[PDB]
Amino acid sequence: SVEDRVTQLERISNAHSQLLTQLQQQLSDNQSDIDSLRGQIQENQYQLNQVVERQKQILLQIDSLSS
Amino acid sequence: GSVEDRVTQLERISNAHSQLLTQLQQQLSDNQSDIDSLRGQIQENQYQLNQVVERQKQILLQIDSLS
Amino acid sequence: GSVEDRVTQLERISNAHSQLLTQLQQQLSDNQSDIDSLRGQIQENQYQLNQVVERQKQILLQIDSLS
Ligand code: AUC
Numbered sequence: 001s002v003e004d005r006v007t008q009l010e011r012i013s014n015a016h017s018q019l020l021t022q023l024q025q026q027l028s029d030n031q032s033d034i035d036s037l038r039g040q041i042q043e044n045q046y047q048l049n050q051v052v053e054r055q056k057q058i059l060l061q062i063d064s065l066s067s
Numbered sequence: 068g069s070v071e072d073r074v075t076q077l078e079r080i081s082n083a084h085s086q087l088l089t090q091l092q093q094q095l096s097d098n099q100s101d102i103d104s105l106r107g108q109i110q111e112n113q114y115q116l117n118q119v120v121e122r123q124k125q126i127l128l129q130i131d132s133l134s
Numbered sequence: 135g136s137v138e139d140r141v142t143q144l145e146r147i148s149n150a151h152s153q154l155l156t157q158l159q160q161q162l163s164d165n166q167s168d169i170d171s172l173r174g175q176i177q178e179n180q181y182q183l184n185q186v187v188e189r190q191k192q193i194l195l196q197i198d199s200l201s
């Protein structure tokens with residue numbers, strides 16, 4: 001059974017090897033995907049900041065206009 | 068030391084590896100769904116941003132006449 | 135070759151798997167952490183965006199009294 005247990009081990013080892021290299025490729029793809037998503041969230045944030053800052057100016061212009 | 072002892076160890080580790088690989092796969096899949104979910108969320112947020120930009124523009128000319 | 139050789143090999147590949155496994159676990163946790171963080175920020179963005187929308191309604195009202 002030793003020969004057979006060992007053969008079973010070499011087969012499972014092989015499948016492990018193949019899976020691990022798949023997990024590795026996907027993980028590093030996901031990191032990049034996340035980089036893109038962070039990129040967009042940050043730009044969105046900047047756009048939001050610009051919008052908010054312009055609201056303040058609008059609110060201030062309205063006050064000047066009120067006089 | 069004996070081959071039987073070493074194969075027994077190897078089997079023990081092999082099993083631990085199979086359970087770990089399953090958890091990895093389960094948790095990788097969760098992280099991929101989240102990537103897709105986050106991406107859907109960002110698209111929705113960009114969309115609302117643009118509309119806000121365009122309404123703020125409609126306000127800016129409403130104000131420009133009254134100046 | 136010998137069951138001895140095949141077992142030594144299995145042990146060497148099996149150590150390689152354990153190390154790689156630790157590294158992929160890490161990389162996956164980093165991907166989870168980055169997602170959770172990014173979820174927080176996109177909710178904050180949207181919360182502030184909702185405040186900008188209610189603010190613009192008040193701005194139209196104020197604009198109405200000016201004319
Ligand atoms: N929605 C919206 Au606005 C401004 N300023």
Ligand code: NA
Nearest residue numbers: 167168170171
């Ligand atoms: Na986090």
